Paper text:
Co-crystallisation studies revealed the binding mode of this chemical series within the NgFabI catalytic pocket as a ternary complex involving the [name] active site, the NADH co-factor and the inhibitor. Key increases in potency were achieved by expanding the right-hand side lactam to a diazepanone, from which the extra nitrogen provided an additional interaction with the enzyme via H-bonding to the carbonyl of A199 (compound 1; IC50 6 nM). Inserting a stereochemically defined methyl group on this diazepanone resulted in supplemental Van der Waals interactions with the lipophilic environment of the active site (compound 2; IC50 2.4 nM) while its enantiomer was 5-fold less potent (compound 6; IC50 14 nM). The introduction of a hydroxyl group in a suitable orientation to this right-hand side reinforced the interaction with the NADH co-factor via a conserved water bridging network (compound 7; IC50 1.9 nM; water bridging network similar to that shown in Fig. 2a). Finally, bringing together the stereochemically defined methyl and hydroxyl groups enhanced potency, resulting in Debio 1453 (IC50 0.6 nM). Interestingly, Debio 1453 also interacts with the NADH co-factor via Van der Waals contacts between its benzofuran methyl and the reduced form of nicotinamide, and via a H-bond between its central carbonyl and the ribose hydroxyl of NADH. These multiple points of interaction between Debio 1453 and both the enzyme and its co-factor may account for its sub-nanomolar NgFabI potency. The NgFabI co-structures described here achieved resolution of 1.3 Å, higher than those reported previously for S. aureus [name] (1.8 Å)21 or E. coli [name] (1.5 to 2.7 Å), which provided sufficient detail to leverage the interactions of the right-hand side hydroxyl substituent with a precisely defined conserved water network binding to the co-factor NADH phosphate, thereby reinforcing non-mutable interactions and increasing potency.
Inhibition of [name], which is an enoyl-acyl carrier protein (ACP) reductase that catalyses the essential rate-limiting step in fatty acid biosynthesis in some bacterial species, is an effective antimicrobial approach for various Gram-positive and Gram-negative bacterial pathogens. Importantly, [name] is essential for the growth of [name] and its chemical inhibition cannot be overcome by the addition of exogenous fatty acids in vitro, underscoring [name] as an attractive and yet untapped antibacterial target for the treatment of gonorrhoea. In the current report, structure-based drug design using novel [name] [name] inhibitor co-crystals guides medicinal chemistry toward increasing potency in the sub-nanomolar range and drives the discovery of Debio 1453.
Author numbering:
A (entry chain B): 4 to 260
B (entry chain A): 4 to 261
Amino acid sequence: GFLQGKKILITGMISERSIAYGIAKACREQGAELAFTYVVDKLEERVRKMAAELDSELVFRCDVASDDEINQVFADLGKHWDGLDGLVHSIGFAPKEALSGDFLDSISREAFNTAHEISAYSLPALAKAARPMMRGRNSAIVALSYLGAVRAIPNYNVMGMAKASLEAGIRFTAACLGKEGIRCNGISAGPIKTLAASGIADFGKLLGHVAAHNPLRRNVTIEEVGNTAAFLLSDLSSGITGEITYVDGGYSINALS
Amino acid sequence: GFLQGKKILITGMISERSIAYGIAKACREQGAELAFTYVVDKLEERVRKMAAELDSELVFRCDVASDDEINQVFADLGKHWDGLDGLVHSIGFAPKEALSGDFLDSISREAFNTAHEISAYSLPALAKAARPMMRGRNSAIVALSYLGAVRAIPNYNVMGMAKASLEAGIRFTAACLGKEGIRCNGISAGPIKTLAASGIADFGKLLGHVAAHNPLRRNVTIEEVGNTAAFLLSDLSSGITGEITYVDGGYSINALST
Ligand SMILES: NC(=O)c1ccc[n+]([C@@H]2O[C@H](COP(=O)([O-])OP(=O)(O)OC[C@H]3O[C@@H](n4cnc5c(N)ncnc54)[C@H](O)[C@@H]3O)[C@@H](O)[C@H]2O)c1
Ligand SMILES: NC(=O)c1ccc[n+]([C@@H]2O[C@H](COP(=O)([O-])OP(=O)(O)OC[C@H]3O[C@@H](n4cnc5c(N)ncnc54)[C@H](O)[C@@H]3O)[C@@H](O)[C@H]2O)c1
Ligand SMILES: Cc1c(CN(C)C(=O)/C=C/c2cnc3c(c2)N[C@H](C)[C@H](O)C(=O)N3)oc2ccccc12
Ligand SMILES: Cc1c(CN(C)C(=O)/C=C/c2cnc3c(c2)N[C@H](C)[C@H](O)C(=O)N3)oc2ccccc12
């Protein structure tokens, strides 16, 4: 496969419905060796199990709210790996109450700060902590974004501001690290029913809307997202950096439907 | 590889420097079976010889000025192949004098009409002619664009208008064909010293500028473009349609490079 020899760290894999699971599966299918992070101690067993099915025993606790925890991942991983070829950012969070209802009524300073720190700052923070292991390796970062970065969407509210910050982060990270042989790209995925859809009322209606309106007349899968991530983590994509690739079956490019 | 057994028709391969040659070599490396077009009789032997080195003896004349020739390609190819999995558009042309100097002084009606017919109309025209063969196969189209579509660039002049038309054509073709299982995407490549650069003055200066300013601090290769095309032609990219992907080492996303 086209990721033979690559060693890739994957964040955000919490269940088999996670986008990060689709990414991990697609990467392992292409020959990569994987390592994983998980946010709280409570999740360790589930993540070790999924990791084991993908032939990995390399699992590390990481709350991206914590500079120390982020740094410790790379310290620990560096004892097993000579370097890091791929880094997958698949972390997005805002307080649930900020993701329902009128944008201004639902926003607060605290929710804004949390959403941006966890969903956007985490990309430069991870890239910076990974830099010693990634520099000079012709390596690559992939982060997951969503249409709310560039379009107003009902209920997505402050997460759209956070995604816009993330996508600018992708550009600035790519501009910073390209000379030393690290690429940084985004995927803007169409909606997928993961654990992110939990408590998001009418997610089903969103899915039906996208499948009724997009060129492919269907919703995307975690496999389709994951195969695109695999490509972006591979040397096949060596001419691409700072890019946001839409894996939404063409949804964003249609109007007047 | 990930195009094993896929049948792909490639336009625009005229030398080993061509973008289309990079795409061909990348697709063959992933297992595809290839077929090729050439614009005029003068080129037939060169392209047949290149094709043979890529394990193909399927080569067809096609000047995209001619609807007869465009549709004749697929009639002839259809005698060999029961269907088509991939279609590569790597064709761009404007009169040389329209590509030098002041945009308005250099433009003319004839040059505008030629640039748009050859460089933009040829994408829907080829997609339309290929539709019967490509239908229902989870097949894919890839076309080459350039940053002039979306940014003003010295000397590129009317070709920028033609590339804008082309990129809209990619979106409209994607929206048209998606229900029938055909995807259509673009690659916006960084500058490359192909035969296209011949007769373009100071092309080396343009290359130097891009390598000085882009995130990667280097120009891209036809191999990099080709591997992206291979991905976009494959089922790995089945969630992507109507997209323009920049293979320019990040050049387009940088500013204020002093
Ligand atoms: N599901 C969709 O429709 C969709 C579409 C496009 C983009 N996205 C984005 O894709 C990414 C993955 O989401 P998903 O849908 O797979 O959901 P998911 O809930 O499976 O994954 C989100 C992950 O973020 C992690 N996370 C949250 N806070 C964290 C913290 N402080 N530190 C570390 N990890 C933390 C969670 O533990 C979880 O693993 C997110 O960035 C999301 O915004 C989702
Ligand atoms: N070289 C660059 O810097 C660059 C960067 C981005 C995009 N592009 C685009 O890539 C494509 C391929 O160009 P290239 O750089 O590989 O140069 P090239 O000269 O190798 O290929 C151009 C091709 O266009 C064909 N063509 C011209 N008029 C035609 C006609 N009437 N019918 C059929 N074919 C015709 C030529 O015969 C040739 O094969 C073009 O669309 C070009 O605009 C080039
Ligand atoms: C699409 C789409 C998505 C799916 N999507 C594109 C996302 O980025 C989701 C992000 C998200 C962030 N924080 C959460 C989320 C999801 N969900 C539950 C509640 C989680 O436990 C939590 O407490 N915070 O999320 C939406 C939210 C509103 C409107 C549309 C969408
Ligand atoms: C980059 C860049 C490119 C390279 N590029 C991105 C192109 O699309 C080139 C297009 C092209 C079209 N018609 C031609 C061309 C090139 N060259 C010779 C003369 C050919 O034989 C002919 O008679 N017409 O071309 C440029 C032209 C001007 C400014 C910048 C660029």
